[PDB]
Structure 1
Amino acid sequence: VPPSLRLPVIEAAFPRQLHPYWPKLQETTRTWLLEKRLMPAYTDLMAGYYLGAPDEVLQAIADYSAWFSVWDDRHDRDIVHGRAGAWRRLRGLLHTALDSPGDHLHHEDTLVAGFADSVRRLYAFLPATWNARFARHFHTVIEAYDREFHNRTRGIVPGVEEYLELRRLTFAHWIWTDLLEPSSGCELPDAVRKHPAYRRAALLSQEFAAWYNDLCSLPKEIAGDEVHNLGISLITHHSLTLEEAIGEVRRRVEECITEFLAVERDALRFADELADGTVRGKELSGAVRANVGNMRNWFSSVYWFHHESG
């Protein structure tokens, strides 16, 4: 790891974890991409994150994660080609397929059909109230991708706070947070997952992942003159040099880690409180503990992914 990207606290205090299903995961996702014609003839990131997930849940999550990267690529291609109509039509179909995936399983657009299959499968694990929350969150993600389309085709660099708000949606913070719950086998009650310690631990895990991605791409994403990156917002609106922007993003990433360590303690104290001597409480306690454990695993999975992925 180059010194500008190295984070000793991750290396020393966040040991990597790997889900035992990882070998089958890689090839089964590749087979799904081929069968769905989503790439002409990433799973490790999920296998280091959703520890404890049932094999079938981890497979559905990995296929969705692979689909997501194929969507990011189509979005980028529509942007650089100025295909505003094609993007608008896709945007509309993803909104519709999210609410009615079965209707879109054999759509002419293979990206839409692949999306529908992955969502249909994710909808099969937990009650319909979880499905509705996933859908609510992902409708918001789609519209954030539309805002990025608008910004990038017009060459607009969002302000720092504007970007930070937008990135919580284009990175899909709340989708990865939602997916903790099928991974530990339990839809959490609103009073549990909205506990301030759970909420803050969940946020910091995703801010680390998004901002570290921005750090691992700032120099390349200048050069070619991009606009969506915390470092680019800092250079453009705060007159930072590239070196100054790298240091500022790095400090913000480092603070996510030590803020997370403090709130993790509170979240695990909350998990202890949930185990109140009843079976239901022990089950909720264990689900919270598992989910917070995987919020922690996201730090190390993301960190080492950026130094392994091409």
Structure 2
Amino acid sequence: DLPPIYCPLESAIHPRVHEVEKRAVEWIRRSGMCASEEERAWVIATHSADFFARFAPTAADEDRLLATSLWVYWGFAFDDARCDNGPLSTRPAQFNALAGRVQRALEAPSAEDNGDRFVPALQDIARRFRSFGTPTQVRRFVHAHRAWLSGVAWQIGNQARGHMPGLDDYLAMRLLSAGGEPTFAMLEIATGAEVPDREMHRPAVRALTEMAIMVAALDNDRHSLHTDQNIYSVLMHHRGMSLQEAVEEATKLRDRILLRFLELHDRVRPGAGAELSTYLQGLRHGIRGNAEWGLRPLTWAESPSDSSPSPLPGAPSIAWWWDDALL
């Protein structure tokens, strides 16, 4: 019993998606990233190029769309083999060092793989980003990437302990561990449109970005549907709901965040410069694209399941999203 997804946002897909996907599938075979044929097939079947082509559906340079799509594949592969499943998945001490080595390899081209098959793959993606984006944009990606790995470390930490975070911590963690920071920070790299520091770091824009990430993360928890750390288990544990009531509750929260995204967007967009405007539409396309890609004649909710204009109850760390003085 899943409600349709409320997502009155623009759905589009890059016209060169099949071409980029073909190049991606090839890179995957050359990359050394995958141990077996079965693993490669799994990685390919993510259709990560279909995915990221929905985030940057008018990217002028197919190579930029390719590079960024590769990291989406990389991310799914690294996630499935190192974060979500293998020995490190409940071994935070070992993961902290992996995260340190992997993150260092991203920042330091001279780093060596130390027998890790994921590292040369990542260093190649990074090499592509450094040839395309400005050092400022690469730093934004780099910082977003460490942010994601910090979320995963937090999550693997939780898993080791069997700790089910509360709502506030879960959203804070999941904001990072679902991969949205580094995903959305590639928008600029894909489109070529650099957002100036003064605009990019405006509290309002920081908030729209976090909100986009949060809706996408929560649509992913949906798509996933426990001991597993997800919105449904969090609400089941912390509020004693049945699965059905948690399903309904999660959809309200998520819809409420999306309405705030839409209201703040409408306030911010008119005065936005062109680079920021493009970034903002990327946030919209990504929210929609993430939902739709998870689904794939589709059906969508015409109305939000909840329309309260105030901060989400029990989630203080996101309440500043509704603070227009601060934004």
Same-fold status (TM-score > 0.5): yes
Kept after mapping to 2: 8 A contact 1:197/1:266: no
TM-score scaled by length of structure 1: 0.84
Q: What is the RMSD of the two structures over their aligned residues, measured on CA atoms?
A: 2.1
Distance 1:190 1:24, change over 3 A: same
SS where residue 85 of structure 2 aligns?
helix
Distance 1:111 1:80, change over 3 A: closer
User: Partner letter of residue 29 of structure 2?
Assistant: L
Task: Give the structure 1 partner of residue 185 of structure 2.
Answer: 178
Provide Cα deviations, 1:109-167, integer angstroms capped at 9, x if missing partner: 21111111112212222222222232222223222212211211221111111111111
Give distance in 1, aligned partners of 2:24 and 2:96.
28
SS where residue 16 of structure 1 aligns?
coil
Matching of residues 36-51 of structure 1 within 5 Å: 36-39=31-34, 40-41=36-37, 42-51=48-57
Give distance in 1, aligned partners of 2:292 and 2:94.
35
Which of 41, 47, 58 is equivalent to 1:52? 58
Give distance in 2, aligned partners of 1:82 and 1:162.
19
Task: Give the structure 1 partner of residue 16 of structure 2.
Answer: 21
Kept after mapping to 1: 8 A contact 2:9/2:284: yes
Give distance in 2, aligned partners of 1:266 and 1:291.
15
Distance 1:48 1:38, change over 3 A: same
Query: Shift of the alpha carbon at 1:86?
Result: 5.5
SS where residue 136 of structure 1 aligns?
helix
Distance 1:85 1:254, change over 3 A: closer
Distance 1:4 1:129, change over 3 A: same
Query: Shift of the alpha carbon at 1:107?
Result: 5.4
User: Partner letter of residue 188 of structure 1?
Assistant: V
Query: Shift of the alpha carbon at 1:84?
Result: 5.9
Distance 1:195 1:96, change over 3 A: closer
Give distance in 2, aligned partners of 1:301 and 1:93.
32
Query: Shift of the alpha carbon at 1:290?
Result: 1.4
Give distance in 1, aligned partners of 2:270 and 2:274.
12
Which of 93, 103, 121 is equivalent to 2:111? 103
Question: In the comparison of the two structures, how many residue pairs are matched?
Answer: 283
Give distance in 1, aligned partners of 2:87 and 2:216.
24
SS where residue 108 of structure 1 aligns?
coil
Query: Shift of the alpha carbon at 1:94?
Result: 0.5
2:296 aligned with 1:301, yes or no?
A: no
Matching of residues 220-239 of structure 1 within 5 Å: 222=226, 225-226=227-228, 228-239=229-240
Provide Cα deviations, 1:200-252, integer angstroms capped at 9, x if missing partner: 3222211110011112224xxx2xx32x2122111111111111111111111
Query: Shift of the alpha carbon at 1:80?
Result: 7.7
Task: Give the structure 2 partner of residue 250 of structure 1.
Answer: 251
SS where residue 123 of structure 1 aligns?
helix
Instruction: Percent identity, please.
Output: 22
TM-score scaled by length of structure 2: 0.80
Which of 71, 74, 88 is equivalent to 1:67? 74
User: Partner letter of residue 31 of structure 2?
Assistant: K
Give distance in 1, aligned partners of 2:181 and 2:88.
28
SS where residue 232 of structure 1 aligns?
helix
Greater helix fraction, Structure 1 or Structure 2: 1
2:135 aligned with 1:124, yes or no?
A: no
Kept after mapping to 1: 8 A contact 2:137/2:189: no
Distance 1:57 1:73, change over 3 A: same
Give distance in 2, aligned partners of 1:109 and 1:80.
13
2:20 aligned with 1:32, yes or no?
A: no
Distance 1:94 1:306, change over 3 A: same
User: Partner letter of residue 13 of structure 2?
Assistant: L
Gaps in structure 1 of 5+ consecutive residues: 272-284
Task: Give the structure 1 partner of residue 101 of structure 2.
Answer: 93
